[PDB]
Amino acid sequence: TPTLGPVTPEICKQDIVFDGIAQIRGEIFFFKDRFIWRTVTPRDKPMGPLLVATFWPELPEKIDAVYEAPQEEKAVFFAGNEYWIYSASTLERGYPKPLTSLGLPPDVQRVDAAFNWSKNKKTYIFAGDKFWRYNEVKKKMDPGFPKLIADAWNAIPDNLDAVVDLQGGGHSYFFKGAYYLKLENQSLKSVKFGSIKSDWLGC
Ligand SMILES: [Ca+2]
Ligand SMILES: [Ca+2]
Ligand SMILES: [Cl-]
């Protein structure tokens, strides 16, 4: 049963479902195994692949989600039942910590997606058909969660692959499979959907 790691992927030639997508200090990063591709805030051709180890050497060989906390521009990485927090490429003291240190229940063993909602600066952690709202200031979970994605959100599917709110202009992108949904922060109405290859990788 032991197997060899994966081969380096070709972004536009093959169908890649990324492990996480996030905007870290201006740039949009696409994660897939030990690889990363970066594009500077657009819809055009990412520079890569580079290795996740070039920037964050402590991380395991595959992540489940990643977002950046606005309060202090820190990067938060989820992998299995643990999370790491970095300043830049500097791991913070006391990490990895089990997901429960964030207020998530013991049963949650993997996270699907995560981002910071610019409309209220809160953090949303998605896992399966439910999500949690984390208060980054009080550094604690809010009351009344988790809630089901289907109940609380507008046409957002379960089992998301990633989610991002681009600092530029108030629109939240929800990624799933080969597609993404675009939500208007204010209205919360799905303004459109499109292709990740076309609209994000600039294939
Ligand atoms: Ca994210
Ligand atoms: Ca993911
Ligand atoms: Cl994500």
Cα–Cα distance measured from residue 78 to residue 59, given in angstroms and rounded to the nearest whole number: 9
Joined together, the tokens standing for residue 193 give 């959907």
| Domains in the chain, number | 1
Q: What separation in Å is there between the alpha carbon of 32 and the centre of ligand 2?
A: 10
Name residues whose C-beta falls within 8 Å of residue 11's C-beta, 6 or more positions apart in sequence. 30, 37, 46, 48, 49, 201, 203
Two tokens at 18?
Answer: 């990324």
What burial class does residue 179 get, using C-beta atoms within 10 Å of its C-beta: 0-12 exposed, 13-18 middle, 19+ buried? Answer: middle
Phi first, then psi: what are they for 150, rounded to 5°? -55, -35
Work out whether strand 97-98 and strand 122-127 pair parallel, antiparallel, or are unpaired.
unpaired
The rounded distance, in Å, linking the Cα atoms of 91 and 119 is 28
What separation in Å is there between the alpha carbon of 66 and the centre of ligand 3? Answer: 5
3-state helix/strand/coil string of the chain: CCCCCCCCCCCCCCCCCCCEEEEECCEEEEEECCEEEEECCCCCCCEEEEEHHHHCCCCCCCCCEEEEECCCCEEEEEECCEEEEECCCCECCCCCEEHHHHCCCCCCCCCCEEEEECCCCEEEEEECCEEEEEECCCCEECCCCCEEHHHHCCCCCCCCCEEEECCCCCEEEEEECCEEEEEECCCCCEEEEEEHHHHCCCC
The encoded tokens of residue 135 equal 């208060």
CA 170 to chain centre: 17
Is the Cβ–Cβ distance between 20 and 36 less than 8 Å? no
Distance CA 134, CA 124 (A): 6
Please report, for the domain that includes residue 94, its CATH number: 2.110.10.10
Token pair, residue 150, equals 């289907």
CA of 23 relative to ligand 2 center, distance in Å: 14
Residue 118 is encoded by which pair of tokens?
Answer: 């610019």
From the annotation, which residues make up the binding site for Ca(2+)?
Answer: 19, 64, 112, 161
Domain that residue 42 falls in: 1-203
Experimental method, per PDB record: X-ray
